[PDB]
Design a protein around this ligand. Structure first.
Ligand SMILES: COc1ccc2c(c1)/C(=C/c1cnc[nH]1)C(=O)N2
Length: 294
């Protein structure tokens, strides 16, 4: 840490804490994530290092990955504000639709990019999406779950957010697909539109049942194979699907159809990032500038 000055902590992720820091040597302002260890799986270290080669306008740049003193540091470029803070700051007025559309479009471009390189994020949430004054938005903190394993108890006893978890993960699937990122993004899109989280579960079963209460308890008809999933129980209550116009009312029909495709239960039917970019919703997409208070 002697190389940096921790201006201020800026967040605690499921895999570690992130600080805004200044490189005393170069004066560069960066985001430093310190990972919570014994020997530190060198296997992860190699995979994480691979991520340093991801170069995309909508992906936060990973500058360095350092293993030293039983701790792993990730040095990232620093962006102005995260989406969680921006949504909170825009709570009274709401984010303008053109800007929500712009952000969703850019996020899908970023996902289309990483997914074509066989990289999954796995834990997308508003705090992992960063924005700048120029109107860009970027995905931050990929992998980790690919190099490590699905968390449960952070070194700080952090309250892991389950709100954006795809149903196949909640039902114990062992092999995640790129579709889990589309689900998370769908949840975030709904939240930007309504100004309320879509599925705010406080436990895994509560998370699952909130999804079921809105989209209907899945069955073999809509999701072949669901009844044989690891954590599926025949005793799950059977809720009928709610009319979808109640889900994200401020949204026009193009927006609702796209969201419905991002929230399909069956990972195989759920729209891909590439197909989503072609959806009619983006026919009139533009790149507005947000009003940011830093
Ligand atoms: C979650 O992991 C990361 C990774 C890289 C990052 C930030 C967060 C991050 C967060 C942030 C929050 N408010 C301003 N920046 C930043 O600037 N760069």
């Amino acid at each position: 840490m002697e190389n940096f000055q921790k201006v201020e902590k800026i967040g605690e992720g499921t895999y570690g804490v992130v600080y805004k820091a200044r490189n005393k040597l170069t004066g560069e302002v960066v985001a430093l994530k310190k990972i919570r260890t014994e020997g530190v799986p060198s296997t992860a270290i190699r995979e994480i290092s691979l991520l340093k080669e991801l170069n995309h306008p909508n992906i936060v740049k990973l500058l360095d990955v350092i293993h030293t003193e039983n701790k792993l540091y990730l040095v990232f470029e620093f962006l102005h504000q995260d989406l969680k803070k921006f949504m909170d700051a825009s709570a009274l007025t709401g984010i303008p639709l053109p800007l929500i559309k712009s952000y969703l479009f850019q996020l899908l471009q970023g996902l289309a990019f990483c997914h074509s390189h066989r990289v999954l994020h796995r834990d997308l949430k508003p705090q992992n999406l960063l924005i700048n004054t120029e109107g860009a938005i970027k995905l931050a903190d990929f992998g980790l779950a690919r190099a490590f394993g699905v968390p449960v108890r952070t070194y700080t006893h952090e309250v892991v957010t389950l709100w954006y978890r795809a149903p196949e993960i909640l039902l114990g699937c062992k092999y995640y697909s790129t579709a889990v990122d589309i689900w998370s993004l769908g949840c975030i899109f709904a939240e930007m539109v309504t100004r309320r989280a879509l599925f705010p579960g406080d436990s895994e079963i509560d998370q699952l049942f909130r999804i079921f209460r809105t989209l209907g308890t899945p069955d073999e008809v809509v999701w072949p194979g669901v009844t044989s999933m690891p954590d599926y129980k025949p005793s799950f209550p059977k809720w009928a699907r709610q009319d979808f116009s109640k889900v994200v009312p401020p949204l026009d029909e193009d927006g609702r159809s796209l969201l419905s495709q991002m929230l399909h239960y069956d990972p195989n039917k759920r729209i891909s990032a590439k197909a989503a970019l072609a959806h009619p919703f983006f026919q009139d997409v533009t790149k507005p500038v947000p009003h940011l208070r830093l």
